[PDB]
């Protein structure tokens, strides 16, 4: 394989930077890469990936109501509900 | 009646004033404050750049009107308070290498946001000329094996770099401890050694 | 004549510890517009030598990050926009300045960095050989 | 006329320029203290008259950055130690010291000592998940013939 | 030879601020800081100033009664270093057990009026208080004088008021001090 | 108050996955070698699969943020391309700019 | 026929501005970004997070200043500090302009933990750069 003074050498040096010291395949080496990163799930990119929507859109509606927040969409929306309640068409009642 | 808009203070501003009073830290450029009669926008046909009044452009701009020369030289008196004078005995770089073998880097990381967290900010760079260190033929030797790719035969520099601790400190102190431990098993001696 | 009588010092004080020595300090600032990073320059370098700081500049290439979309939103594969990010660099070398020196500039600098400028700033910092370097165990 | 900061006093107190200043902060903070100090404050209060003002009273309450930027401020590691993060060996304690237990736990540490991110709490208990596992696990690994338990 | 290292120089996290305030003037032709730098905007007599003035607090107060009604928005937090006086507050008591716990936590909370409640139900089930917080209780009775402390929302004479808790709670004290009178 | 039922159901993976990230990485790393007994291999096989699962990272989508739009997001920007294009050609983004050479 | 962000002239008579008169192609050649932040250049992270602030606090304002904004806002991120620059029309009262102000600044600090600053420029008119 390799002189044994080689061999020990590197042994040393990987003892002092804290690599693995024992002959170890790659397929246990998955465990040191596994537990060196961060798992992919634990990344902020991952678990935080979308904006906290409901955060938004409650603090949204919020502000619209006591009226700090003038959502036009919104009063678009009511404008053309009431006008839909006028022309006959409504939501039935649930489990009837 | 409705509310009349009173006339920019520019008016009211002398030629022989005290700019950095006007703006003494940054701030968006304002019409109502700038006196030059600054144009942006691209023209029409027949036509002149937008005046400042409304400028969007400008508004764009981070403009400089609050770092002039004058006000860079002010801050700068104002600072010089704070400076300490650099050693004039080792005026050249050879001397820094004579009394200083040891160079640590670390990068620190300035951008936008309301996060300062960077890790990127964490590595450090321990550069030491092995001629500068207290070492014999065999140490010597022992030591270059054992960094193996760490060490530049060209530049005679051994170069460690720590980014194994989340922290700045902690990657200092081990590249420190790492130079201590490398230097001290360079010096030791193991039986395997014999058989070269 | 509404000058202030008598103005107060901000408080300074001398620490019995030595002060830090750095042998170079590479401020590498980043922007999107040529203009704004000549300006900061041009700010840096007046604040510099006013401070009496050695400071040499240099513009490192700039990078283009390119990318590729399609143009259309059901189906037009054969049509697309091609978008840009243009990173400019600028490089301020300083040399031999103090830990005090260059904390206060780098405040200084920092401080009044232009919004869309980013900075990264590499501290060499000089040192003595540890204690127990010296000599083995 | 004549200084007027000088001549005949209440003649009540004596010459003690000490005030009332013996240490008591092991009593709880006193509301009325506290209160005080507003008034103080108020006292103190003026509107920002320039924008540095604004923004020594912004880093003041802390929500402005404080130059020069250092990216780690605010934040200690739990105020671990290099040695702490990286030799975790002293952990293995109730592992074997030698089979292939000892082996994958040598890989694990080994993984955790690299890793910038998780803090030393964290790995500690990774190692105590991975010690109450396989002691768990006691009877697999007595009939698969490894030491352990 | 021998190099000279200079010892360090130390300062606050302001001080470079400061020095740099230190050479800027008031502006002689600018409205006071407080107000928008605007024509339009910048107020024109002393009545324009205050009224400016008190309308960004009223916004100020109507943003924090918000923030303080509806705390579930506001308790993410992406700031590093944290910002603890942008995190939402806490003025109501949680602890419910009839205890030195939830009264104690009224009293920093100053609700007197449940603060005397819990008290006034720990007296009748005889459970532990402490001297300092039955003393912590008088203060703030005295200071407030049975006034509820104003929040967001939900001259002459004597303020005082011949019957009150507080005089009440210091007749029932088991035991005075100094501190006390 | 999600875009749509999809992005619900991706918020839900999300959460889920990081709760037992670290339960999933502590098994996971059990199987991913060849040291310990195939037996302890086997039983930590039957645990990864006893976990629930819409707990694995591979079920978890980059959708976009705004539109949920499930392909055609840009990772950097975490934006289907249709947004990203309407806001970098209103110009509020920075730096992005149309690229021409 | 490219229809992305243009302004198609009709009758010569809508009036336009600076901003709404340029396409797109025009952004590194006339008209500036409307934000300005570090997270889109080489390097950066958190473009994303920037990007979703900078989209909420645009409908933000919006709504907060109903008929009142003359132009799109100007967004500028310094360190952790944030400054909306606004071009705003003078119908409002200026009371109702401090309240908003004061309003809006404190909120949007609270919400994203950031010196959140807001600066208007009044104009008596939407300013029109052409008319198409």
């Known amino acids: 394989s390799l002189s044994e003074y080689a061999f020990r050498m590197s042994r040393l040096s990987a003892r002092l930077f804290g690599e693995v010291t024992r002959p170890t395949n790659s397929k246990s080496m998955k465990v040191v890469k596994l537990f060196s990163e961060l798992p992919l799930a634990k990344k902020k990119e991952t678990y935080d990936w979308y904006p906290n929507h409901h955060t938004y859109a409650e603090l949204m509606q919020t502000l619209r109501f006591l009226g700090l927040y003038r959502d036009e969409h919104q009063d678009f929306m009511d404008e053309q509900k009431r006008l839909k309640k006028l022309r006959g068409k409504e939501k039935p009642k649930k489990g009837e | 009646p409705r509310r009349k808009a009173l006339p920019p203070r520019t008016e009211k501003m002398a030629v022989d004033q005290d700019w950095p009073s006007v703006y003494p830290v940054a701030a968006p450029f304002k019409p109502s404050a700038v006196p030059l009669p600054v144009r942006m926008g691209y023209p029409v046909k027949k036509g002149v750049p937008m005046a400042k009044e409304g400028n969007l452009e400008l508004l764009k701009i981070p403009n400089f009107l609050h770092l002039t020369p004058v006000a860079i030289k002010k801050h700068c008196e104002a600072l010089k308070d704070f400076c300490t004078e650099w050693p004039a005995a080792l005026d050249s770089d050879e001397k820094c290498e004579k009394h200083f073998p040891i160079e640590i880097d670390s990068t620190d990381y300035v951008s936008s946001g309301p996060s300062v967290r960077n890790p990127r900010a964490r590595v450090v760079v321990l550069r030491v000329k092995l001629s500068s260190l207290n070492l014999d033929d065999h140490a010597k030797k022992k030591l270059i094996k054992l960094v193996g790719e760490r060490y530049c035969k060209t530049t005679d520099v051994l170069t460690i770099k720590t980014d194994r601790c989340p922290l700045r400190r902690q990657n200092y102190d081990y590249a420190v401890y790492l130079l201590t431990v490398l230097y001290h098993e360079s010096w030791n001696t193991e039986e395997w050694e014999k058989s070269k | 004549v509404d000058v202030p009588k008598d103005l107060t010092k901000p408080v300074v004080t001398i620490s019995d510890e030595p002060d830090i020595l750095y042998k170079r300090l590479s401020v590498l600032v980043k922007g999107h517009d040529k203009a704004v990073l000549d300006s900061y320059e041009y700010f840096a370098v007046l604040a510099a030598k006013e401070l009496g700081i050695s400071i040499k500049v240099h513009e490192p290439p700039r990078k283009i990050e390119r990318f590729t979309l399609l143009q259309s939103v059901h189906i037009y594969k054969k049509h697309r926009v091609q978008y840009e990010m243009r990173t400019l660099y600028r490089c301020l070398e300083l040399e031999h300045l103090t830990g005090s020196t260059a904390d206060v500039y780098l405040e200084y600098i920092q401080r009044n960095l232009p919004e869309g400028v980013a900075m990264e700033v590499t501290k060499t910092q000089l040192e003595q050989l540890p204690e127990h370097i010296k000599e083995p165990i | ?149 | 030879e021998e190099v000279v290292i200079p010892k360090k120089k130390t300062w606050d996290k302001v001080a470079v601020l400061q020095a740099l305030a230190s050479t800027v003037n008031r502006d002689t032709t600018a409205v006071p800081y407080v107000f928008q730098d605007d024509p339009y905007l910048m107020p024109a007599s002393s009545l324009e100033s205050r009224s400016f003035l008190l309308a960004k607090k009223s916004g100020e107060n109507v943003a924090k009664f918000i923030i303080n009604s509806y705390p579930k928005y506001f308790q993410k937090d992406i700031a590093e270093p944290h910002i603890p006086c942008l995190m939402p507050e806490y003025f109501e008591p949680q602890i419910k057990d009839i205890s030195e716990a939830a009264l104690k936590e009224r009293i920093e909370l100053r609700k007197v009026k449940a603060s005397v409640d819990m008290f006034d139900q720990l007296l009748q089930a005889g459970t532990t208080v402490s001297l300092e917080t039955t003393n912590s209780l008088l203060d703030l009775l005295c200071y407030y004088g049975d006034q509820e402390p104003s929040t967001d929302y939900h001259q002459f004479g004597v303020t005082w008021r011949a019957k009150n808790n507080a005089e009440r709670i210091f007749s029932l004290m088991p035991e005075k001090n100094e501190h006390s009178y | 108050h999600y875009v749509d039922w999809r992005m619900w159901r991706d918020v839900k993976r999300r959460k889920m996955a990081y709760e037992y990230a670290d339960e999933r990485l502590r098994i996971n790393s059990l199987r991913k070698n060849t040291i310990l007994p195939k037996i302890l291999q086997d039983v930590a096989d039957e645990e990864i699969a006893a976990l629930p699962r819409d707990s694995c990272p591979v079920r978890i989508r980059n959708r976009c943020v705004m539109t949920s739009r499930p392909r055609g997001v840009k990772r950097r920007w975490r934006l289907s391309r249709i947004v990203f294009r309407h806001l970098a050609d209103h110009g509020q983004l920075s730096g992005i700019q149309r690229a021409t050479w | 026929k490219n229809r992305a962000a243009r302004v198609r002239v009709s009758k010569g008579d809508k009036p336009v501005t600076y901003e709404e008169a340029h396409a797109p192609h025009y952004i590194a050649h006339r008209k500036g970004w409307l934000s300005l932040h570090t997270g889109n250049l080489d390097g950066e992270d958190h473009a994303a997070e920037r990007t979703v602030e900078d989209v909420f606090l645009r409908k933000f304002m919006w709504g907060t200043f109903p008929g009142c904004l003359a132009d799109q806002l100007v967004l500028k991120r310094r360190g952790n500090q944030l400054e909306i620059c606004a071009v705003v029309l003078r119908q409002l009262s200026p009371h109702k302009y401090y309240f908003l102000v004061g309003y809006s600044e404190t909120l949007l600090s609270y919400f994203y933990k950031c010196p959140v600053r807001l600066h208007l420029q009044t104009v008596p008119s939407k300013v029109v750069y052409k008319y198409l």
């Open chain 4, 1 to 149: 006329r004549k200084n007027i900061f000088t001549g005949k006093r209440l003649n009540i107190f004596d010459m003690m320029a000490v005030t009332k200043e013996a240490p008591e902060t092991d009593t709880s903070p006193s509301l009325w203290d506290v209160e005080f100090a507003k008034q103080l404050a108020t006292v103190n209060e003026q509107p920002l008259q320039n924008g540095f003002e604004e923004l020594i009273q912004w880093t003041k309450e802390g929500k402005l950055w404080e130059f020069p930027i250092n990216n780690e401020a605010g934040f200690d590691d739990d105020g671990s130690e290099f040695h702490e993060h990286i030799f975790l060996e002293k952990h293995l304690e109730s592992f074997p010291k030698q089979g292939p237990i000892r082996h994958f736990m040598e890989l694990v540490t080994c993984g955790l000592s690299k890793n910038p991110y998780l803090s030393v709490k964290q790995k500690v208990e990774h190692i105590e998940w991975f010690r109450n596992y396989f002691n768990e696990k006691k009877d697999i690994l007595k009939e698969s013939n490894i030491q352990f338990n």
